[PDB]
Every structure is written in structure tokens, then in C-alpha cells.
What does this fold into?
Amino acid sequence: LETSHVFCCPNRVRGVLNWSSGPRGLLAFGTSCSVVLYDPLKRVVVTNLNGHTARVNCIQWICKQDGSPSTELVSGGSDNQVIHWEIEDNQLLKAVHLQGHEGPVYAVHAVYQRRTSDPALCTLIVSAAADSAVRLWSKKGPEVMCLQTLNFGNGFALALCLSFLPNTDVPILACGNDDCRIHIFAQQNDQFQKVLSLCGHEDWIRGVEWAAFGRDLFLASCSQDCLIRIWKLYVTLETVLAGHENWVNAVHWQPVFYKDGVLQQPVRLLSASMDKTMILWAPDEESGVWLEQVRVGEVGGNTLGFYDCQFNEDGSMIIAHAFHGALHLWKQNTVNPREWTPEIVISGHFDGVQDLVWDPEGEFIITVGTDQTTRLFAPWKRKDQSQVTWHEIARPQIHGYDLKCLAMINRFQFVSGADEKVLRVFSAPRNFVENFCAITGTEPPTEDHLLQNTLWPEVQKLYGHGYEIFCVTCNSSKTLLASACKAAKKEHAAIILWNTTSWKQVQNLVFHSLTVTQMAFSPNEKFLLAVSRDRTWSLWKKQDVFSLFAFTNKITSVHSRIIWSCDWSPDSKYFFTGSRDKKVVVWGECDSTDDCIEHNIGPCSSVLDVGGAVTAVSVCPVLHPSQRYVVAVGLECGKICLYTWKKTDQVPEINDWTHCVETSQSQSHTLAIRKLCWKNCSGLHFASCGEDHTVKIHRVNK
Amino acid sequence: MRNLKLFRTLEFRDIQGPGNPQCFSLRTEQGTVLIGSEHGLIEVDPVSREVKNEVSLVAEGFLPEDGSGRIVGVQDLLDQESVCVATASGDVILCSLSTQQLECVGSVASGISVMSWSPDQELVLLATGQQTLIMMTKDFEPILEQQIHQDDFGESKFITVGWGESALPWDDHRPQVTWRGDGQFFAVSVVCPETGARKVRVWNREFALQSTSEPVAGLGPALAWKPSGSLIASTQDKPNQQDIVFFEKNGLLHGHFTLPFLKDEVKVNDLLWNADSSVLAVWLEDLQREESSIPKTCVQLWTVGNYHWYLKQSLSFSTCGKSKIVSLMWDPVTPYRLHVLCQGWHYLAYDWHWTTDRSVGDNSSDLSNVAVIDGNRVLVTVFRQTVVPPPMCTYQLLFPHPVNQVTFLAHPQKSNDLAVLDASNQISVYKCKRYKIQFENNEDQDVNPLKLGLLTWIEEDVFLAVSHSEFSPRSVIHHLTAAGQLNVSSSAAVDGVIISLCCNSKTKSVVLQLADGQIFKYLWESPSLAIKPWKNSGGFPVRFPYPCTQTELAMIGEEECVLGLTDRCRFFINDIEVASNITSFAVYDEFLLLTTHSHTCQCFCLRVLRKVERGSRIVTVVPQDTKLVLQMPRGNLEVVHHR
Amino acid sequence: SGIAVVAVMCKPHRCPHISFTGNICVYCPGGPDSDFEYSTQSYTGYEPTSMRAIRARYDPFLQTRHRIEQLKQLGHSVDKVEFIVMGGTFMALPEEYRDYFIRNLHDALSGHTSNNIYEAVKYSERSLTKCIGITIETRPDYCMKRHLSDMLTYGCTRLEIGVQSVYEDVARDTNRGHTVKAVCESFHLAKDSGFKVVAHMMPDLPNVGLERDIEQFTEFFENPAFRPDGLKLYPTLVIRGTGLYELWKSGRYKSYSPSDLVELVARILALVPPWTRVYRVQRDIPMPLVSSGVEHGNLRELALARMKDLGIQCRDVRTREVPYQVELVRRDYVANGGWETFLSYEDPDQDILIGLLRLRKCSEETFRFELGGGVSIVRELHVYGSVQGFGMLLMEEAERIAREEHGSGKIAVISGVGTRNYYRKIGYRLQGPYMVKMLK
Ligand SMILES: C[C@H]1O[C@@H](n2cnc3c(N)ncnc32)[C@H](O)[C@@H]1O
Ligand code: MET
Ligand code: SF4
It folds into this structure.
């Protein structure tokens, strides 16, 4: 069971994006409650570093002394915990947890110690939390402990940096603060006496950074007062200033890179601001007065952003992290040094995904998110490489309401619902068809073209439901819709059937007394099943226009609580129901074509007990000999399991169900699952989404 | 914040004539009562000091002819010089004065239960026995005759969208009519034969049925429209308590208050408003306990402050029959004056004025106390320390009986005590933060309710009271002192009626005021207790042109002087009349403070112009910190520092 | 130099009393069920705040930033701001959305990114751009103890409870949903909580005559039950899409004559007490949408002109607000079972106002744990003049009369965020949401 593809986007925090310096380098931005390793060479992520319970805020690599690519890193989240991560080759060996720091952790830094006697990679960690506190952590081997702490009373720490004195090995610490008074001093028990506290800025200082020293320790200072000040340390201090309007929040010097055997240390800076601007200050040849090299950014547009900017290896590119979770990568033109171009990167929903559905042909997947957006994902064939990558192709609509349900009728026709009373229908335009055929058989678009030039029209507007739409479905022939509304009374909660060719109500089945969670037609197209929050289900049969044929009162229901999902069988002979009672029940009726027996509906098979709440049950569409059924279950904690069911002879409760492969730690969602959609077959792959802002495509074969 | 006070008890008794008087009216413009009895109409002038006798008596005994034939209404015709009279038989006549001639003007085939007149005396209404109210023009021209038991709601219906106990047994079936102050609407009360309970209806001036009463349970047979504003009072006897409620023009209940009696002990007879919509008079009757033969017949006066109905004064009457009230009314020309006619041919006139019960003193140990009466409780506020808004108080004292009068001792250096007179003619003394009850003395002689006049506390053991004689009105000063209080002495009956009994804490000087205007200096410690005309600079002619509601004694310059203020915004200083715009004033430690009605506050000192809101009345002054406490009509106070 | 007002609006949502009844109030225009797209509630979607909010798709952060930028552009400085959350019944949404909204507001103002509301407020306390307070509107049936506690946590310091008319038949016939007694109880609880209540009134309801309106307003300013601190006038407008529109179309309702309306406004203004403020006298609904109602926007000016003509004059806070000979004036009264005090500084002859304060003894119905020992309270301090400084004098005198008259031992103040530091500088400590000082 291998995870083919994953889609996600970074969190909306300062300093969530970090990149190792080296021949390869690695990005380590954080999604909801996990850290993502993603190669930037227009490739896919490699692993997922799960483990945090709450949101993840700060990520930083451990700088390597000898120019090697980084090996370990640190992440501090909102779970009051700081995690040190070690990987050998994309493998997540021996993560380490660190406790303390009540309140969210909002700053971390890590440095390799210069120990001479013990070369066992002695590491130093500084952590600043939301409790006006900063603490230390020295790690040697697997030995971790805290050290001298520092309270700020009411003040808070905003930016942290750590380095060494130019000649003597002295660990120096520069802390940002909320009082325009960045404090630079020593920290250890042997050296923790504050020496100086600069006061150059006139606002909250959101950035400080120890620079690569030619011969004196250069230092950057960045505050909300729209000023950047460079301070030189030698035990003496100097001061230089710069100029650029609006909030400035991201400053970093160019690191050292090995140019053909010789390390190189240029002089350059990099500033990212809320006004959609990013600057490349450089000292002057004549008098060393810093002057701009190039203005880059969406100047004059909307959606003010650029929380972060980070500087590529050897100045090849620059990456930037914006307000709405969208990255921006710029690449240098070797032919023209004074010219840069945007580049293609990863994307994804910035809020919990709710639903998706496969392409009827099997090429693309469409997602809707509580971020009030609809997005489309399709693979890229390129021209030569056997490796195939998937990318965000189109953004059909940016709605003003949340989205909950979605259905597909034609290959370019889909119906969407929202937390409102109406239903919407969308059709692909003609430009999209040609652009897609060029992509599948030009290149994936960048961010701005997606944001502005890519939308879909509205064709219809379905009325007359009464309340918020909660579920949608379609039949096999793609000719009859079905929807339900969120309701708290028997009258309101009713099933409405529409006609696809006319968009008019046809019939108004009403049997349930509370909200209907999910419905499903049958491949036989002679039944329709609906489970409700009333801890019960109903089955409706078309007559030769639908009538009631099955029934389930309170007593005749094995489930005790809300039934969450339901599914049919490819032979249209049995069906399955998963509830919040940690139990899945398959009901067998064997009734198809003509059955003159009245009712006779029974479970006919055993009951299981998964580890937790069930929110998605799916049945693989293809059938194999031995009449052996397979079921995919999406649990609540975030894991997915596969089970196999075979009909027994006389006793249901004897080895009725067999176990199969389970999702491992790396390939498992974090918060909850919402759908399990198998790829269409008969002219293995399936997709899963949830509230992790992430979409995953899996693969398995026997 | 303010209280009523009695200053005139005109009384004429032993009226002779026909038997069992039934109803009466009043004549203004040098007129008097016009009692009409079973035989005819009697005119009596009691106003004259030495003359209280019938004038131009007439008889008509041949219309009812020895039968019941009760007169259902008597009304003066203002300047027309005639008295319209309606009899129960169904005849309306127009009599005449000095001519003793009759004039039958209208006849009705059914009994005329109630006859009422418009305030402007232009339209008159007849409640026939046919349940058909009728309008007559001023000169008895028929206008309209409408049924009273019509069922439809009327005109002022409610526009609505689709989104969403019988009558009291002791109530005689009898219609009651009223009018509003401006004469634009009127109200009719009647029992509903369909239902069996009272049900009010409101008519426009031109017989346009406006609204009908909501079906409230336990409605009583009372009806009284407040002259100004829009309130109509009634009773809503509930299973647990007895309450007085209000309607409005649309016919909906709105606000009420509670009568402080038992569940089933009394009943309501009638409700009357004063001349300016400021005092409500309620008449009650003892329903049960025939052993004492209705020992209680109380009339009470109620006022409103910050939406709190106080109980100001209470009057008691026996129901023996010899002294039993048969009618009562308010003077339509001047406020705070009511007239009462009893069964035994007795006529009474009561006059009140309006005052605050301050506590003057020296510069130290003063506390500037202020006292307010409310039911059987007294609210005392110490304005030196805490400036409490009116509805609350610095502290509260409770009594078993209702209170009628309070006073502060005038002894300097001890002006921190008070004497209270209850309705049971008992005196309670409170003396020096909190207070403990010192004494509850009982009077020796008391025969008529509310007979003691102005009660003044001069020395820590003496009290001065005023009693008014019946024949040849003469005022007698009583000295009350004892260890049970004995009327030790009674001064000579002076010629006339005394209005003011102001005293000075300094020099222990007492000043008397007569109705006509002379000022007399009486010596309470005199061996002869003789009175003396007030001493002016020379000739001693001091006489106020008009009686003064408030009289004060202040030492100006070196000698003493008398200051007076009347109800017509006139200020007198030993008969000088400095100016005529003042509304209120006060004197304290050579400081004269006074409003001006021209929105200013003069601060003349004895040996300057600030700005004030509308209608500010001075309440109290504290020379310490030099702070004075104005009061606005809406209820709030206001402390200001002049200097 | 001066505080800047920032108005934000919420997402559309149905009012709560639609379930057990049939519909919403018979006159409120707009709403999710109305014919105006993105009509939150009581708003067509044409006032500047309306499309200003729509442009951000009802995002707190974006709306705050856009308004701040606009104000900064036109010279105005933004050191001090005051938030106003409009858009119908806010305290009916699920808790999660409310927490989201308020936390986003605070973080937008500050810059720090928070998880819960507590971290947001802790960080915003340290900001360089200070927030004086927040104001929200709420129906009386949603102002119980828990709601008040939540409002205290958010830092809101001023309610906008709307009681349309004192008569109960009017409420029951317009399907308002509650009773007047509930309104009085809500005022009682809010006043003993320590807020600054401002009420809404509508002087043209159906089945209400001119005489009824005058009487009800006189009672409103005389009855110790109501006696509010600030008043807004909203003359009724007949907007399409409401039950009132159906009534008017059916030829069963008529609007007041323009001269009659102007005169009524004149009398109401003349009757206003000195210590009560008049925020507004009109509604900003676009003119060509109303079928019947007010004449034009020139309503305040006509009222003042007629009042000057008839010899009456208005003495409210706004008109009397702006060396000169100043003096201390003190006023006291009663409201909702509480002893209210109105210490102020003013110049009599030129009837101008400089500094003011609001004290109140705490009743026996108080429930907040910080107030359980006879604590006083300071509902509001406001100074806009210049000279020690007047604020020192007002606080000193208020503490004096609290220690002496009220006989209290502890004093508490309600404040925003920067005001917390201001009061801490004069010797206060923070307890709960209040700023407390032990008064001997
Ligand atoms: C925001 C304020 O608008 C008032 N309001 C509701 N409907 C109308 C209308 N048709 N015209 C004017 N004001 C109205 C509400 O009563 C609320 O107090
Ligand atoms: C916007 S209407 C006024 C606010 C709230 N809906 C109320 O009626 O109390
Ligand atoms: S409660 Fe307020 S906002 Fe809601 S419908 Fe009624 S008036 Fe409009």
C-alpha cells in the first residue's frame, strides 16, 4: 500500500517555512498537525512527519558546519511541545519530544555546538513560548534536559537567533521583544549576564538574524516601523539603516555555498513585506551604501501577504510564503542576472477539505473545502520522463459560503451545495477544455493566473429545499439527483428527487424525523438507501415512482448511535453501514429483480469492532472469484483499514471477517477522514480526504 | 420630598331645612353650597364670619309629591344665573335665583340615573332607564340617542397580522360617567347583562365609539378620568389583594398599585382627582364587622413621585349616620381644597398647602436632615453626608398607624430630633447616627378627626397647637406639655383664623399670621400670654397684601425682619414687595437663596447669578461646603457649589 | 488625536425566534430569506459598511485592514480605535464562530497570531495600537448571565439592546418574541454587571398614536425602570419584503405627516435629560428603496430649527459637548434598583461640557464573583478637553464619594486594553476583566 500523491499547503503563521542549505536542500513547511518534506525540483513530497496534536508553528533546520546537507531539525507547535526530528533518508528515525512551556510555542532555534573533546554532535536549542518565557535544551546523543530559564514578566519574545563570537567560542543569543529592545546576551549558567539591549527601532521588532561574518559579526534588525537596521559587532557595536515602507517581517543574509571546492560568502539581504513586496538590498561598490537590485511582487494588487521569505541555495532562487497559504518561487535568469521569473510549486486547500469525486473517465479529481473554494487536480505528462506529477489545474469558483456536498453528472458538469438554501450547477468553459487537452494530450499555471483568469460560469440555480443542504448523490444512469436538508423536525427533513434534464422536483419521499447524513443509489438502479441521524435507515424501491419497501424502527436497529455512512455492493445484493458506535454492519437481503416475499430484511452477517468512530465505509467496485468482498474503512483518528468479508454457511459469528493491510504512521491522516472514493473500473487506486487540509491518493494490488 | 399640610378647617354645622340631603353642588364667583334635598333646593352661605344661613331658599315639593323623588343631579350654570336640576322621576328643570320660579325643560319616560355636564358647560348627557344615553345641547336641543349595550368593538380596532367571575355582589347596578380635562372624550361604565361584569366604553365628543374595555376580572364600580394626561382609575379586587388600576384611551390595563388593607375588609365608594391632576382622593367603606356598625369610613390622599404612589394624609369618619358622609367634591377653581357634605346636614371645607419639612440649625451638629411621609413609614435623609435620590433614604422608620404630621425641634445645638403625629392622635419622639424611640405620648382631649392644627416643637418639653372654633371663627393656641400629654394652657381665642406659626431658633421669637394679613408677635413664655402687633421700624403697620404660603423670620442687618412668599410668585419683605417672579427660597445663617423663574439662582447674603434648568425648586442648603440641592420635576436631584 | 470608529459586520444568519414562532419581526428588512442577496439582517446591502463588508466576503481580518488603510490615507491617525459589530443578533451563532470572529479582530489589530481568545487579548494588551472598546447588539432574550459573562471575556463594554416600545400589545402584535418585563430584567442585569446600556426606539409602530408616543417617551424618561444611558431614534420605514409592507399595501397603515414627525422629534429632543446621550435620530437605509417613511436625511436640522422656533432647547450630551470658567456639577438618580451618580465638569453660561464620569452602587442582584462585598463600580470615564488634569480630579472625587457615601470598601472599573495600563499607572490591579483598587 503506497501513497502515490499528496496535496497540501502551509500554515498561516510567521516562520512556518524553512529550507536546508546544501547541494540539495529540503523544504519543511508545516500543515495542520504534521511536517511535510517536499523536494522543490518540481517533484512531490517524500514523507510526512506526524506526531503533533495541535497546530504546528515554527520549523528550523540545524545548520551544518562543513557544508553538508542538514540531517536534523526542530519543530515547535501549539501543542505545548517541541519536537526534534532526525531522518537518515526520508525515514523518520527516532523523533524526540520535549515538554514544558505551558502555552503555545512560537519560537525555536537550534545550533550545533563547537565542542572539541566530545564531537558527538552536541546541540543547543532555545525555545520561546507564549507564557512570556524562554528556555534552553542541550542535547548530546539521546540525552535531553532543560537549562537556565528566563522570564520576561509581561514582555514577550518575538524573534530568536543564536550564533558565536568571532574568535572565542562564546554562544551569543539575540532575542526579539515587544518593547523595541532586542536583547543580545549570553544564556548558559556560566554565561547568562545581559550585556546590551539595542533600541534602534520604534515598533515591535518581528525579526533578528545573526549574519555570516566576514571578520565582524553582522546582525539584522527588522521591525514594524518600516525600517531595517544592520548592526556590526566587534566588544563594540555599530549601526547602519535602510528604508522601505509598511510592515517588514522577514530578513535573511545569503548563506555560504561550496563553489567547486571553495566556500563563498557574498553580501546580500532579502526583505518580505505585507505590501506585497520583496527586496534584495546589496552594498555599494563605491561607498557600500545599500541600494535595491529589483522590485518583485504583486504590487498594487489585493490579498496583502508575504509572511515569510527564504533564500535559496547559492542565490539560485527565492521562496516566499504569503497570507493565503500560497507560495511564490522566483528563479534567476543566468543569461540576464537582473531578471527573475516565477516558478511552479505545490498548492492545496488552506482549510478542511469536505468532499471529492473521481473523474468518470478517471483523469482528474475535484475537491471542495470549507475554505469556500473548489479546486481541480490533474496529472502532468511532460514529454520524456516516466515520472508523472499531479498539479492544481483550475479553480472553478471562489464562493462566499462554505461548501459541504458535491456531485458529478457529466464529465464537465457538477452540482455543488453550501450552507445555504439553494443548489448550484457548473459547466466547464471552452478555454479550459483546450488548456487541459494541451496539458494531458502546456504547463501547469502559476498562482496569479489561477487566482484571476480561471473561473467557471453558473448555469442553473435550484430552489425550494427549505434549509441548508447536507448531502447529494446521483444514480448509475446519471439521470436522477437526490438531496436532503439539515433539519430538526420530521416535516423539514425529507428527501427531494430532481430530474437532471429539466431541473425540477419529481417526488418528495418523506420518512425520517431528523437530518439525513448520506444516501446512496444502487448499481442495479432499483433501490435507494438513506441513513439518518435518527439512528435508522430507509430503503425505497422503484415501481414499474418510488415507494417504501424496507423499514427500521428504533428496536430493529443494531446500531445505538448516529449512523454516519452507507454503501452498496457491486452485485447489488448486499449493503454496508458504518456508524459512530465503532461498529460496521452489513445487511443482506439478496433481493433483486422480482421478489414476492414481504420485507424479510436482515443483517444476515456479524458485527465488527474497529478501534474508533467510523465516518466512511466504501466497497471496491471490482469483483474477483471466490465471492470474497473487500471493504475500506476510514476511522476517526485518521487511520484507514481494509477488511475482507465472506459469507459463512449457517453461523454468522464464526470468522466472518478477515483482516488486511493497515495504514502506517507516515501514510495516515491526522484529524479525521471524510470520503473514500474508488477509481472507476471495468472501462487499484482510490482517494481519501479529510480535515487535514490534505488530499491523498493511494495504490494497492494483490 | 414634599408633603401636604393643613392650614384651614372651615366648618358649618346644624343646617336646617328638608329631610335627608342627597346631592349638592358648588357656586364660584361669590357663591357657596347649593344642597338639594327631597323637598327642594337650598342655598347656604357659610363663608361669612358671622353669617352662616340660608339665602334665597326655594321649594318645589309638588313635583315629587311626598314620594322618594330623589334629585339625581344639581349643577350651576356659571354666568347664566340658573341651576339645572334633574329628578329621578325623569324630569329636567331650570330653576332661577331670587325669583323662586320653575321651568320644566325636559321630560323622559324613564328614570334619569345619572346626569353629567361637560367641563366647558356646553354638552350635557343623560343616562336614561332605557339603557340609552342621550346628548342634549347647552339649551336642551336633542343631538343623539345611542344604545349602551351594543356589542361591536367600535372604531379604533387593532391591525393584526397572522404571525404568532361575575360582578361584585356589593355593587349596585348603576352607570357612572366622567370627562377628560379638555372635553374631547368621555367614558361610560356599566355591567354587561350578556357577561355579568363591568365593562367600560369610550366615546368621542361626537358619539364615535372608540374602544371597549378588555375583559378584566373583578372590576369595580368606580370611574375617574385624570384631568390632564390620559389615565382612568378603577379597582380590580383580586383573590388575594385589593388594587387600584388604570386604563387608557384604547381600553387596556396599564399600571396599578396596592391598597394597604386586608383581603376582604373594605370596599371602594368613589375616586376623585384634584384641580390640577396632582392629588388622588379615595373613599373607602368598611364592608364587614357589623359589631361596631362599620367603624371605619376612611378617605385617603395619594400622590405620585418617581412612579411611587405615596400615602400622604388619612381621614377617618364613623358610619353611625348622624355624622356620615354623603357627598364630597374638589374645588374646580383652586387646588388642595375639598368640600364634604355629611348626612346630618353638616358641611366641611378642607384646605391644604405644600411644604418641605427641613431641619435648620447652627453651623455645627446640624446634618441638615430632611423627612418625607409615606404611608405608615417615614423616610429620613441626612443631606450633610449622603445625597440620596428621592425614592431611597438614609434610613427608614416604621409605624403601626398612618402618619399625618412631622416636625423638627428648633432648639439650637440639638436640631437632630423629630416628633411625629400618627392618625391615632399619638405623638412619637425620636432623639439622638441611628435613633431609639424615646416616648410615645397620648393626647388628653380629641373629639373630631384632624382637629389639631399646626403642630410646632419649640422647647424640648413644649408644643404649640392651633384649634379653630365653629361659631365666629376664633383661633385658640394650646400649650402641650407633660411628663400622656396634658393641655396645660389655652391662650385667648384671637379674632380670626391663624395660618402661619413660624418660629425662630434664635431669640426664641414666635410669629403669628392671620388670614387677612396682620402679623402678631405672641410670647409663649408671657405671664399673660397676650399677643402684640408685629413691630416695624415705626407705626407698626406690617400687613401682607395677601396671605403668604411660607413665612420666615430672619435677622437682617442688626434687627429681625419677616419674609413672606405666596403662591402667586410674590415676595414680601415687611410689606415691600421687592419683586414678583420667585418660585421658592430658603434662609440659613445670614444666607438668602431663591429661584427666580427666569432661570437663575440669586445668592444674596445678609449683612451671584448662576444658571438653572426648567422648574428647579430649592430643597436644602448646606452652608458647610456651601452646597445647595436643587430638585428637577423629573425626580433627580442636583447639588451645586455656588462658591 | 481622536479615536476612530471601525465598523464590521457578521455573516448572514437567521434570527433565533423563527423556530417556535412562524416568522421574524414583522418589520425587519433583509435577511437570508429576503430578496436582497447577502442581506445579513436589518440591512439591504447598500450602506457603505454593507458593500465594504461584502468586498471582504465577511472576513474580520480583511475588513479591519481595509478600513484602517482608508482612515490612515485621509490624514487620520489610528492610534486609538473603537470596534462596532453590526449585523443583527450576534449572540445566537454557535460559540466556535463567535470565538473565531473576535480572535481574528484582535489579532488583526495587533499582529500576533493567536489560537484562543485569551491569547489574543493577552497579546493585544501589549499592542502599540490600543483598542478602547467593542460594542455589540443583542436581543433581550439573549442577555442572561452566561451571555454577559461571554461579553465580558471578549472585552466588549457597551450593549445595544433594542426595546422597540414600552407597550406590551405592540410587542405581542409584531411577533417580537419576548415581553417588556424581560427587557426590564435585562437592563437590571446589565446595569449591575457594569456595562453602558444604550437602547433603540422606533416612534411609529402600528396601533400607536401621536399622543401614545409622547406619553410613552415621557414615561420612558420618568419611569425608574428604564432610564437608559444613550438613546437612538429609528423612525419606522416601510421596506419591501416585510409583513409591514403587506399591511401598508393592504391600505391598513399610514405614516405620520412630515410636519407631525418633525414636531414629535422636537418634543422628544426637548424632553431628554442632561445625562442621556442621543447617538442617532435617523436610519441610513437608502432613500429610493423605502416605499413610505421619512422625508429625507435632513431630519436633525429640521428638528433643531423647529425647537429653536418654539422656544425649547435640547440639553443632551452631544449638543453640549465641544480657560473658560469651569465648575463641578453633581447629579444623582435611581435606575433599575440602583443609585446612579453623574459627576461632571462644565461651564454654565456657555453650557459646554468637558469631563464626565458614571458611578453606581451595586445592588443585591449582582452575580459576578469580583463583585460580592458591596463593591462600587465606574461604568464610564470620558474626557475630551484640556487644561494636574481633569481625569485625576474625577477619579479622586469618585473614590472619595464611594468611600464616604456608598460605604463601600472596594472599587472596580471596566476598561478596554490600553485603558488597563492607564488605570494600572494610577495604582490599580487587574482581576478578571475588571480593574480593581482596594479602597480602604
Ligand atoms: C437596527 C434597528 O432597525 C430597526 N428597524 C427594523 N425594521 C425597521 C424599519 N422598517 N425601519 C426602520 N428601522 C427598522 C430595528 O428595530 C433595530 O432597532
Ligand atoms: C438589527 S435589529 C437590533 C439588534 C437585535 N437584532 C435586536 O433586535 O435586539
Ligand atoms: S430580532 Fe431584530 S434583527 Fe431579528 S428580525 Fe427582529 S428586528 Fe430584525
Q: What stands out?
A: The pocket of 5'-deoxyadenosine (ligand 1) is lined by residues C 27-29, 42, 162, 164, 200, 202, 234, 236-237, 239, 283 (CB under 6 Å). Chains A and B do not touch (no CB pair under 8 Å). The longest helix of chain A spans residues 430-440. Residues 574 and 588 of chain A are 5 Å apart (CA to CA).
